[PDB]
Symmetry: C2
Subunit: 176 residues, 2 copies
Amino acid sequence: KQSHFFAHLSRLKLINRWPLMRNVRTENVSEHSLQVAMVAHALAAIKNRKFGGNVNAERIALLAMYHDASEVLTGDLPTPEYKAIEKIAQQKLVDMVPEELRDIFAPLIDEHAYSDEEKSLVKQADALCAYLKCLEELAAGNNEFLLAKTRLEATLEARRSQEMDYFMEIFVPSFH
Amino acid sequence: KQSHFFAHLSRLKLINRWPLMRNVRTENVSEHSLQVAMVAHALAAIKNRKFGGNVNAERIALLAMYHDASEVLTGDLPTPQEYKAIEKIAQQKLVDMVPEELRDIFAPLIDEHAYSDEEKSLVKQADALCAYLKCLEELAAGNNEFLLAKTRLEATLEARRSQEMDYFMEIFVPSFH
């Protein structure tokens, strides 16, 4: 009868990111995830408004909100077959959803269920938010994020798009 | 041409909730908004799935995400009403920061203006639930400062009672210990 799904989701805030480093401010996955939802929805809106897109931006936000949800079960594995830790964790999380509601939540949690465009937008937003964390940490005189900023920059180019270009041009200078 | 909008949104994680009590763990507005969006979405999908709903559950999530956004300009004012006009002012300040070409997208998310009545009701249900869930968390960690808030959030929840909330409470809420 009773599901522990939301009980586990409530632990996202407990999972800390960037653990191999001194952080001026510790960022948890719940915070990261809201920021990614917000950036991803903006990328989607921009693509629709300016670059011919036909994206469900509200849907994109919701995917972004759940994208790192399995980490309540695994913790954060920092990136310098673990896609298999992740797949298992996502399934175990989806298995907690009552059967009659599970088809709602499965494509939110399971990244393999994302269309190629949805996953592109979500991963653009994730890299920008990671990059933006690097700038905030830099701006507060923390040089430990120098390296991370440089590879994030390689990632950002790899995931380059018109909507990212716009975002970077218009909203990112303000983070200095 | 450069907007400070997202630079200000980034600050939501700096704003702390329940300021007048000792918290076992301090909850920020970013952590709250996410949990509200998750709850709001679930209350919308449940209504749709089991109780004859026709709501856009993704729209509802988005709104929930932005419901407290203006608090990056005002901070958090605990629950006691000209303070509504002041929140109205902070919102429009935030809206004014959006590039003109996107402002019609963002304006309705920040101001309680888009909101259809069912849509505003689901977000408020979710906000009350998440306030209540936090009271449960603190009580179960040994913190009696939250009893009183619990008692008054239960009256708020009765007042906002719905079928989909009844479902949520019965299935998902006892597990928070």
